[PDB]
Enzyme design. Sequence first.
Site, PDB file in Angstrom:
ATOM      1  N   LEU A 215       1.352   3.509  -5.026  1.00  0.00           N
ATOM      2  CA  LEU A 215       0.976   2.551  -4.002  1.00  0.00           C
ATOM      3  C   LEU A 215       1.954   2.645  -2.833  1.00  0.00           C
ATOM      4  CD1 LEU A 215       0.311  -0.241  -6.592  1.00  0.00           C
ATOM      5  CD2 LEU A 215      -1.456   1.039  -5.382  1.00  0.00           C
ATOM      6  N   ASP A 216       1.880   1.684  -1.916  1.00  0.00           N
ATOM      7  CA  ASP A 216       2.788   1.635  -0.778  1.00  0.00           C
ATOM      8  C   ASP A 216       3.201   0.184  -0.555  1.00  0.00           C
ATOM      9  OD1 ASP A 216       0.903   0.541   1.531  1.00  0.00           O
ATOM     10  OD2 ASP A 216      -0.226   2.109   0.490  1.00  0.00           O
ATOM     11  N   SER A 217       3.875  -0.062   0.572  1.00  0.00           N
ATOM     12  CA  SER A 217       4.436  -1.384   0.835  1.00  0.00           C
ATOM     13  C   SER A 217       3.349  -2.409   1.131  1.00  0.00           C
ATOM     14  CB  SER A 217       5.429  -1.309   1.992  1.00  0.00           C
ATOM     15  OG  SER A 217       4.765  -1.038   3.212  1.00  0.00           O
TER      16      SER A 217
END
Lengths: 178, 62, 76, 169, 55, 99, 221, 16, 459, 88, 126, 53
Positions: free
Chosen positions: J42-44
């Site tokens: 995932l990412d931020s």
Amino acid sequence: AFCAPPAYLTHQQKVLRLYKRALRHLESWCIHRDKYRYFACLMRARFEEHKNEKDMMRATQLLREAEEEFWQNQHPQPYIFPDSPGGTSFERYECYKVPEWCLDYWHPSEKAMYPDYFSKREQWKKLRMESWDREVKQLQEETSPDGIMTEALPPARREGDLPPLWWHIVTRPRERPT
Amino acid sequence: EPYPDDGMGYGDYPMLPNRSQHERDPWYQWDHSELRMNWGEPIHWDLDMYIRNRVDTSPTPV
Amino acid sequence: GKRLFVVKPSLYYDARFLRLMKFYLMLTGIPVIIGITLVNIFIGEAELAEIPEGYIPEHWEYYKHPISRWIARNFY
Amino acid sequence: SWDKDVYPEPPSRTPAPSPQTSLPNPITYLTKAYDLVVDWPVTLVREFIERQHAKNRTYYYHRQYRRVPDITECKEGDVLCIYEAEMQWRRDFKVDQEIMNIIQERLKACQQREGENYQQNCAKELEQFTKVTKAYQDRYLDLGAYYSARKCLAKQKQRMLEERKAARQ
Amino acid sequence: FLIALELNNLTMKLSMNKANPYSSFSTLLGFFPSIIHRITPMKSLNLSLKTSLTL
Amino acid sequence: QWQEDPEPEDENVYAKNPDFHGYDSDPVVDVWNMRAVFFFGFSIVLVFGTTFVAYVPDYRMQEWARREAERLVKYREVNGLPIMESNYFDPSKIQLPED
Amino acid sequence: PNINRFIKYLTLFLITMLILTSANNMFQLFIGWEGVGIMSFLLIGWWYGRTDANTAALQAILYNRIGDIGFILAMVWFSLNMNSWELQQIMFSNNNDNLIPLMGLLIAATGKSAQFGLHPWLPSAMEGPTPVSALLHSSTMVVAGIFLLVRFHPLTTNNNFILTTMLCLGALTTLFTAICALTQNDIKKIIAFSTSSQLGLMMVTLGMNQPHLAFLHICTH
Amino acid sequence: VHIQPRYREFPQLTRS
Amino acid sequence: MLKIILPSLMLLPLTWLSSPKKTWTNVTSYSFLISLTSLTLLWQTDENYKNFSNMFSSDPLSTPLIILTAWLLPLMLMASQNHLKKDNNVLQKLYISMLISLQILLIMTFSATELIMFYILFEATLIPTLIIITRWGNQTERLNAGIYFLFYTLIGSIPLLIALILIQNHVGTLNLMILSFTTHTLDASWSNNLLWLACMMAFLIKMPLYGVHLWLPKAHVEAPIAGSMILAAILLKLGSYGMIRISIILDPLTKYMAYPFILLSLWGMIMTSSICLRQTDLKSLIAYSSVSHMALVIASIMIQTPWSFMGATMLMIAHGLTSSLLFCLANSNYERIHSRTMIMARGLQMVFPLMATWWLMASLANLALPPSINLMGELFITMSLFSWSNFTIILMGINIIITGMYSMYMIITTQRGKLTNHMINLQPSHTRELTLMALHMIPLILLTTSPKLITGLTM
Amino acid sequence: SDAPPLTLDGIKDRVLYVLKLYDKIDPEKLSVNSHFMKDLGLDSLDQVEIIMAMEDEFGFEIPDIDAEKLMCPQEIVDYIADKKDVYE
Amino acid sequence: SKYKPAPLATLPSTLDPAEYDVSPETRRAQVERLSIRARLKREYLLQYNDPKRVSHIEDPALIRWTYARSANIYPNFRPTPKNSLLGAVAGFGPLIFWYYVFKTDRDRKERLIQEGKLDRKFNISY
Amino acid sequence: QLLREHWVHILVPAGFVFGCYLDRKDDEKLTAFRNKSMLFQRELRPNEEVTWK
Ligand SMILES: CCCCCCCCCCCCCCCCCC(=O)OC[C@H](COP(=O)([O-])OCC[N+](C)(C)C)OC(=O)CCCCCCCCCCCCCCCCC
Ligand SMILES: CCCCCCCCCCCCCCCCCC(=O)OC[C@H](COP(=O)(O)OCCN)OC(=O)CCCCCCCCCCCCCCCCC
Ligand SMILES: CCCCCCCCCCCCCCCCCC(=O)OC[C@H](COP(=O)(O)OCCN)OC(=O)CCCCCCCCCCCCCCCCC
Ligand SMILES: CCCCCCCCCCCCCCCCCC(=O)OC[C@H](COP(=O)(O)OCCN)OC(=O)CCCCCCCCCCCCCCCCC
């Protein structure tokens, strides 16, 4: 709450904070769940469109323009959770969060009303007695000679040792004391 | 930054910015939790005016 | 079950002060209130009467309540 | 204990009950129960108290003061008769205060008794109140905190001089 | 009842609209609490400390 | 530095005397001073004095002035006299100046 | 932990409200007035660890105090001009110029019933617990100024300027409070502004020569 | 009086 | 009056001959008996004044002040018991002797039938307050505060002495009743104006009037608890009694020489209430509240309405009781935390529920809650001031609004809010200080129940 | 009566429930120790969405700095237990 | 379409332009401010969590604030024409203003009583 | 030994008795107008010699 703020907020942290605040005000405006999901997907698409920026001065300008748009289009009454600051149940139970040092001032009859709990209380106090000097020594040892230091604190570095300044964190009153 | 020498008894007391205690971060464990101030940091000359039970200087939506 | 301790301040000293205050106040007043009830039930309650001719009343005889008359006769 | 000469009260005129409906009256039922439960023991206790009073009955008298010489026949500086006249004046001042209280209670009783007809049937009480307050304003008004027989006499003399000057023309 | 029902259905409708000063005035308490509760205590306490006690 | 005793720290008085009443360090004088304050403060002053003040009769002759007021109203109303005269003093027994 | 404390506070408020309602003289009605105000302060600041609750209680005290100033002006005028605070002597005072005491009673009623200018202490007073909100700020305390105006309605009927400014003030405050109520999100705030708008309707009704309709609306509301 | 809480389903309504 | 003066005089050999473990008990019990004996002056079944002798007398105005002083003396000993526990026996007995000297000389001061004897006892009472404040005060500003208090009061009192001797030479005896009976009108000349100012400014300093009130806050702050009590509850009312006694022989020119002092009092109670709003010291805040209340007393006494004199009397007694209670609560907090900062101790409602209750009733008496004698005094002063001029109601309203604000600001910032959990040196409560609050608050309730005792001379 | 107390197992089950309902996280590779970037990919922004999902379920606000510190469901569960005083 | 800050509605820390065009000296200023804040926090936390402590924690900042608000004012006051005029107006202008108001009201009332035009119908408790 | 230990408890009652005695002395000193006030000028009863002592 459980982590101390840094010297400054980075650009990535500011972008995440703006994203979270924008989505919270979006749910405050949209109310209905399907409407909020649609427009939050639109907002996420906008952020992903402006995600890949390399110049970073254009990115700072875009961040400034985006938060200007947010301040223009923010809800006058955004949704606040009851336990959040500015909510309805915020600081409702500080009148019931009695600190633990009044049991030192309790009468011997009231102490005799709860014998086992009080015996555990002097066991905890004796543990604090034994650990205070070691954790002060650890704090003095781990202090950097430079003037740089943050509000973070070291953990216990060996067996039979406790983290420095653990008393006010461990023995804090419960958020539902009664 | 001290107050200007206009002879009003201020002297060397610093000119802290005219922000109330409402603008302070409420998710932080301030040493004076009601006052939203830490220990040892300078205290505004109008702290009793700028307490959270009193005058607010917070930004408004309009 | 699963009940937890409730941290409270020392209410023992406040309760003790209230108990001692009530004890001394009742210890002196219950005889007083009983005596007041008894005297208003039984004796005194002087009613207004015209002064007989050639009669000089005592100063306490100008007062209505028995306790007031007694204090005025004995101490004034 | 009170008398209608100083606390006048018109005789009550209540109408006879004429119940057109056939439903029982809960007020009459609860009133009869109220007497039978409460009024009889209370009047029994009061009768016991009253016969104890009759067993130990005492009398008290209302004090009366003879008229000392008034401050007009009283020399200045001779503080003996100054003092006697001043305390007689203070006694009469307190008596006039209670007379005012009596008239005010009369006016209030008239207003509460008449109710919606107070603007017409309280004409006599209002007239008596107006006359007595005009007399009170003539005798005791604007004297100050250190009101006295000398100050009252000075105010009366000033009022008489003003009336005599106005009576010339 | 009918007007507020169709307005609530319009809020149910899938479209964001730009807010107007009428709804801002209505939601923000008519600005009377913010304006008065900021200007009158500030002037009162400022006059008190700056003039009365100090001066 | 000039010689000076160090700054004393106030001790928890309840630590050695849990029944401390605020008056004196040892328990006996403390409890007897508590009893003396309670008995001489509330018992024989705040109650006996209150009873004495409550049963002072005719305090500044409110009751006597009430009775005299009722008597004078009855007198002036059964004989048709005014309730209050406009002049306290009789005008015949006052010698006004000629000018 | 303090359910008995809460119940005793509600009972003391009820005693003060009955004193205020059934009082014959203005001093006793004033005793009820400030007893109700102070117990309102305590019940708003029930959760005394909450800064917002303490602030709301303080500003409720402030607006009720300005109402107390208006009441003191009316009480002092009636004491000087009619020698008593007794409503019977007030009824005898119905036949003169009562502009200053009617202005004082109007200010007192505005402060107590949260009309325009002195309104936001009620939606701030929503900060306390819900039974406090209901009993205090919904049914009994808020209609005390309206009740005082109903008490002094024979004086109110003889002054046309007073009637016109009562009508205008009530219409303005019910319009403004309904406007505020249209877009609030907190349900307690919505029904509180509903309470204030209905109080404005009563205030309009007292601007008319209809005090009994205002009291019927008091019970109904 | 006490009823079993439900996580995401419709609660079991009592008859009364 | 001798039957009250002599046993209070004999309290001093009892103090100096009692055992060190029995001195406080014996003196407190016998001073409670002194108050009980002093309650006999309320036997006034006639309009006549209790003239006990050629030198002493009792009055409907003098009697409540005497009873108040005799009641405060055992309360004074109770408050002084705690901060002298680490102190020498000789100095403890000396302090008790100083308080007993205050009580004796104040009874003689209020009961004196002669104004020159009243003046002698006036600064004869000034001396031991100086000694108490200067020796048993805590901070380093006690010496300056004693200098300020003594010299404001003496520069006030010297023209009073000259005016008194001039009045004695002009009339002949300076006896209070002889002056009241053979009062002569003044010619409204400049000599009479200056004589009026000379006999007024001493009591105006002792009140204190606004502008000359600066000795009071520092003396009350740097004074001990007994000094704060004696000042705020007896000495200001002693200046009040002085003006009431001296105003009878000052007709008619007081009707226009009252003008600057009424304005000073009204604007000054507004000013000091604003200072109470923006004050960072609890003792200073209570001191400025006292200044505002005595400014109300000035306004009533100077407008000279009988209703105003009554309101001044009831405000004297009520403000003395509630100010003593407020200083006691502040001193209890000061002995807890060893600090006088208004904002430092915040959440005391949690740890001290009964003391917070006493705080609440004390503040409610301070802000004129009905049907207390406090509000009866302020309301009757309001009525008389509005009769004097209709525009006084604006200043009265501003004063009452800010009075409620500073009282509730006291309550909110000292009791309500989150508890300062770093103050682990918070002893629960002393039965002594709880008894002190109870003995302060119960007579307020009793005088509320029967307000006819403190109505004064006028009615 | 009302408001039943929380449990470590219940908090873990609810957190894993939301993460399983998330479309970007396949339920077969989801574990209590799975990292949002290291093995979840995932990412931020996805992390902020996960935190807001936990926030909306549990009815209270995690502050921004602690929220950015929380990075796997085990840390999320530990934060929930620490905040709501759940010890068993 | 721009927010206008006020003394009672200040500019937000995200709408201000000072933190978008950042500088290394402002960054190191924030770093040093955090260093002082962390040092003070560490000292307070040590004194707070000390078990041998038997009293409260004195605050030198609070002591300095009280001294500055109370005792430093007259040593640090110097008379200037501005504060002289301000003190003169704030100590006199209300007094002369209310003097003229009360004098006009009392003269009007006294005159109305002297020619009797003012009516005191039931005023006996003045 | 009880009188030796608690001899300090009689000084205040002795002062009270002395004050009552001095009040009585002042009362008999101020008798220049006894039964001579014109408000209370009454003929003496045969069983008494003074109106008040
Ligand atoms: C605390 C206040 C301090 C300041 C104000 C002090 C009082 C001001 C008013 C009174 C004047 C001064 C005191 C005089 C006392 C006697 C008054 C009297 O009897 O008057 C009638 C007398 C007149 O007596 P007479 O009535 O017989 O007049 C003669 C009349 N024939 C001829 C018809 C018979 O007035 C005086 O004698 C007054 C003269 C005073 C001169 C000396 C004043 C010195 C300074 C005083 C103040 C000093 C302290 C303050 C300094 C500044 C501090 C910042
Ligand atoms: C549980 C214990 C109960 C004890 C009894 C009740 C309590 C004590 C009485 C309380 C009275 C309160 C009111 C005080 C009224 C004083 C009246 C008065 O003027 O007393 C002085 C009087 C002077 O005498 P004289 O003027 O000559 O009168 C004779 C008739 N012409 O001289 C006298 O009257 C003579 C002396 C008697 C009255 C003294 C009153 C002063 C207070 C005494 C307190 C005693 C407490 C004892 C406690 C013991 C505890 C173990
Ligand atoms: C068509 C005709 C229309 C006519 C319209 C007429 C309008 C008239 C309006 C009259 C009243 C105006 C002034 C009202 C002031 C109210 C101040 C107040 O209490 O503010 C509260 C505020 C904080 O509360 P808030 O901001 O609401 O909520 C924060 C929640 N987190 O701040 C505080 O809590 C601060 C705490 C108090 C500080 C001290 C305040 C002292 C005030 C003294 C005032 C003296 C003069 C009063 C004059 C009254 C005249 C009526
Ligand atoms: C004067 C200057 C003072 C300066 C400060 C002095 C400080 C020290 C004080 C020491 C003591 C002095 C007390 C002074 C106040 C006395 C109060 C008092 O008793 O007043 C009398 C009053 C009776 O009323 P009255 O006097 O007739 O006047 C009203 C009608 N005009 O009484 C009352 O109205 C009621 C009396 C008090 C309330 C009752 C307390 C006892 C209640 C017991 C209830 C028991 C349970 C129920 C029993 C059955 C009831 C049917």
